[PDB]
Design a protein around this ligand. Structure first.
Ligand code: NAI
Lengths: 421, 398
C-alpha cells in the first residue's frame, strides 16, 4: 500500500528549508521540460569508496545496474554568483586509479551532459586531478573540440581556501602567524598554491618545514630556494623527509598544513598541545575519529578542513538522491544533508563558477603558476568570502571548546606548557 | 525473436542522448498511456500518474527511417485525463514540446485522440502564444487521411473488388474523416453509393457535406444520410465498404456486417470489437478488416525501445510499418511544402500528402488489426469467394 511512501515524501518536502530542497524526480528530466533553469558551471565527483556491506550489491553490480555507466546529476548549488551542477561519475575512486583511459572516457561523457545543461566550466573535484594527470589526460582526449565546457582542477581556488583557513584558525586560536612554526606535509598541486600565496597575503611565519617523500629531496631543495629568493622568506627553513609516516620533526611545528593524498601519515596523538592543523585532504592525513576524541576530551588542538569556503550569503542546495540508493538509505544519512551549513561551498567546485563570472581567473590544467592563486584570493576577499568555520567532515568544533583552547593556548600562553619548555 | 530493427534499451534514452550516445532526432510524436486498467496494475490511477509517471514526459522510442529520426514521447496521462482537464493536458504537452526541442525535434505530431481533446491543436497554440523556441505542432490528419485512402485502395485491390461498384459507408466524419472523403474522390474511382453516418448533433453538418459532394466534389452516385443514436443505424450494414473514424469504441457490431464486407477503421480504439472480428475471420473468412492510419515504408525502420523500468517488471511489429500521424511530423521537417495542421482544416493540400507518399513508394500497411495480421492465404480465399457477383449467394446470418 502507498501510504508510507507518500508520507515519507511529505516529510522531506515539509522539511525543505529555504536553502535545502530535496527533489525526488530526475533533475535532468525537470531541466529538459523547463522547470529547472540552466547552470553556469558544474563539478564532477565520484561515489566515494565501495563498502561490501554498506550496499547489499556487489561493486560490479552497482556500476553496471545502479549507476548504469552514466553520469548522474545529483545537486544544484544556487549562489549569488551563478548556479553549479554537481555531477557524479559512475565510478568509485579506485576505479579511476586502475583504468585512466576509462576514467577519461566517462569524464568526457559527463562534460557533454554538463554542456547540455549550460555549464561553461567544469571542476574536477576530489582525487580526479590526481588520477587524470591533473586534467592533462582529459585535455589530450578533448583535443581540438570546442563543443565541450572547459575543465579546471580548481586548485588555485582550493589554495586560497587553505590560506583563508590558516588565517581563520590563527584568529580563533588567538595566535599570530608570524611566531608560528609552520610545517607543510606534502607539497603537491594544492600545496604548491598554498605556500606562495601564504607568504604574499599573510604575515611570514618564524619557521617553515617542508615535508615530502624521499624521491623529492632536490625538488624540496629548489622550493627552499624559491622561498628565500622569490618570496623573500627570511626565517628558518627545514627540510623534513619521510617514508610511510611523517618524520618526528613535523611534530615540532605549531601549525601543520597537510596537502598529501596518502591517509593517516600524521599521528594525531603525537602532536604537541596547542598545535593548529589545516588539512585539505579527502581522506584526511590523520585519523579524524581520534582527533575528535582528543579534542572533546582535552580541547587540546584546533583542526579543520582547508578547502571549504564560506559564502557571505547563504546558498540554496537542491538535492536529488539516486532512487535505488535512496531506499537503502536511512533517516540518519538524510539528516546530514538537511543539517549542512548553507553558507559553505567547497573551493574546488566553486572555482568553476568563478571562471564563468571572471575571465581573468583562467582554468587550470596541470600544476603551474602558484602565484596566480593570488587573484583568486583577492577576488574572494572583494566578495567578502572567508574560510569555512572550523570543522572536520561531520564534526563542527563548538565555539566554547574553541574559546577554551584560545584561553589556554593563545599567544603568550603556548610557551608555558610542558612540551614547550 | 531478435531483429536488428527492434532493439530494447534498458537505459534512459534521455541520458544516453545527453552523453552523446544517441544522435538528435528530426521530429517527434506525442502519445498517452491508453486507458487505466485495474487488472493490469496494482497501483491506483492517481498513484501511477504521481509516482510511476512522475508527471513527466517519457521518451520511450526512436524510429530511424530513411527520411529522418522520430522520437516517441508518452505524456504522463491516460486518455480520459486529457478530456476531463484540458488546461492540465495543455501544460504537460508544452513540457513534452520543451523536451522534444532539446533532443532536436523541429515538428511534433499529436497522435491518437490528443487533437480531439485540445481543440485540434488550437488549445496548445494559444498557450505557446508567441514562444518561438518550441517545435511546431501538427495533428498530422492530412497524412492520416492519405493513409486511409491508401488502405481503401489496398483492401479493394486484395479483395478483388472494384471501388466503382462499392457502396461505401462513412462512420464518423470528424477531422480525419473529412480528409478521407474528398481525397478518396480525387485519387480513386468514385463509388456507386456513399452513406454518411454521424450522431444527431451533426445532422445539418452531414446535410452540408451532401451538397458539397454534388457541387464541389463532383459525386454523381447516390448519397444517403444516416443518423446514429449510440450504435450505428441499420442502413450502414447495407454498405459493402465501411470506413470508420470515430472517437467512441464498439459502435459498429462486427457480427451484423454482411458476408463480403470490407472494413477500414482508423479509430483507436476501434469502433468494433477486435476480438470478435478476428474470431469471425478465423471461423468464416467472411470479411476484410484493417487499420486505416498505418503506412508501410518501402525500406525497413529501426526501432529502439526503452520501456519505463517500473512498468517493465510487470511487462514483434512489422519493421516496415509506421503510423501516418507520427510520420506526418517527419514529413513536415523534410518538405517545407507540407506545412503542419492545427484545427479542423480545409484539406485542400491533402492531395499533396498523397502524391508525396506515392513518389516515395509508400503504401498502406498490409491488412492487419492491432496484433493480428490477416494471412495472405485467407485473403486469397476471400478474394475468390466474395466478388461482387457472389455477395448475394451467401447466407447473411440474421
Ligand atoms: N493513433 C493515431 O496516431 C491517430 C488516431 N486517430 C484516431 O482516429 C479517430 C478519429 O479521430 P479524429 O478525427 O481526430 O476525432 P473526431 O472527434 O474529430 O472524430 C470523431 C467523429 O466520430 C463521430 N461519431 C461519434 N460517435 C459516433 C457514432 N456512434 N456513430 C457515428 N459517428 C460517430 C463524431 O461526431 C466525430 O465527427 C480516433 O479514434 C483517433 O484515436 C486519428 C488520427 C491519428
Amino acid at each position: 500500500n502507498e501510504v508510507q511512501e507518500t508520507l515519507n515524501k511529505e516529510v522531506v518536502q515539509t522539511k525543505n528549508s529555504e536553502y535545502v530542497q530535496f527533489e525526488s524526480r530526475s533533475l535532468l528530466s525537470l531541466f529538459t521540460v523547463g522547470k529547472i533553469p540552466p547552470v553556469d558551471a558544474a563539478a564532477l565527483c565520484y561515489w566515494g569508496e565501495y563498502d561490501p556491506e554498506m550496499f547489499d550489491w556487489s561493486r560490479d553490480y552497482m556500476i553496471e545496474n545502479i549507476f548504469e555507466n552514466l553520469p548522474f546529476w545529483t545537486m544544484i548549488k544556487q549562489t549569488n554568483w551563478g548556479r553549479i551542477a554537481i555531477i557524479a561519475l559512475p565510478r568509485f575512486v579506485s576505479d579511476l586509479y586502475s583504468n585512466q583511459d576509462d576514467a577519461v572516457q566517462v569524464i568526457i561523457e559527463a562534460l557533454e551532459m554538463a554542456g547540455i545543461i549550460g555549464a561553461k566550466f567544469v571542476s574536477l573535484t576530489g582525487l580526479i586531478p590526481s588520477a587524470t594527470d591533473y586534467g592533462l589526460a582529459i585535455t589530450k582526449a578533448v583535443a581540438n573540440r570546442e563543443d565541450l565546457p572547459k575543465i579546471t582542477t580548481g586548485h588555485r581556488t582550493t589554495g586560497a581556501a587553505v590560506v583563508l583557513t590558516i588565517k581563520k584558525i590563527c584568529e580563533q586560536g588567538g595566535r599570530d602567524l608570524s611566531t608560528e612554526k609552520v610545517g607543510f606535509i606534502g607539497l603537491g598541486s594544492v600545496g604548491m598554491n598554498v605556500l606562495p600565496l601564504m607568504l604574499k597575503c599573510l604575515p611570514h611565519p618564524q619557521e617553515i618545514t617542508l615535508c615530502d617523500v624521499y624521491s623529492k629531496l632536490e625538488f624540496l631543495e629548489n622550493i627552499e630556494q624559491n622561498l628565500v629568493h622569490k618570496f623573500g622568506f627570511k626565517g628558518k627553513i627545514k627540510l623534513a623527509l619521510s617514508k610511510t609516516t611523517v618524520p618526528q620533526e613535523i611534530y615540532d611545528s605549531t601549525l601543520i598544513v597537510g596537502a598529501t593524498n596518502v591517509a593517516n601519515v600524521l599521528d594525531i596523538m603525537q602532536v604537541k598541545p596547542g598545535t593548529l592543523i589545516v588539512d585539505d585532504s579527502g581522506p584526511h592525513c590523520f585519523s579524524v575519529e581520534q582527533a575528535i576524541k582528543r579534542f572533546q576530551e582535552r580541547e587540546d588542538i584546533l583542526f579543520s578542513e582547508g578547502g571549504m569556503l564560506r559564502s557571505p550569503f547563504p546558498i540554496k542546495t537542491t538535492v536529488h538522491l539516486l532512487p535505488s540508493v535512496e531506499k537503502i538509505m536511512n533517516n540518519a544519512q538524510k539528516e546530514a544533508v538537511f543539517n549542512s551549513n548553507p553558507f559553505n561551498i567547497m573551493g574546488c567546485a566553486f572555482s568553476a563558477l568563478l571562471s564563468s563570472q571572471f575571465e581573468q581567473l583562467e582554468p587550470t590544467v596541470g600544476i603551474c603558476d602558484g602565484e596566480q592563486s593570488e587573484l583568486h584570493y583577492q577576488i574572494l576577499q572583494e566578495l567578502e568570502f572567508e574560510a569555512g568555520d572550523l570543522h572536520c567532515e561531520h564534526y563542527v568544533l563548538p565555539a566554547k571548546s574553541i574559546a577554551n583552547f584560545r584561553q589556554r593556548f593563545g599567544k603568550d600562553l603556548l610557551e608555558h606548557h610542558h612540551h614547550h619548555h
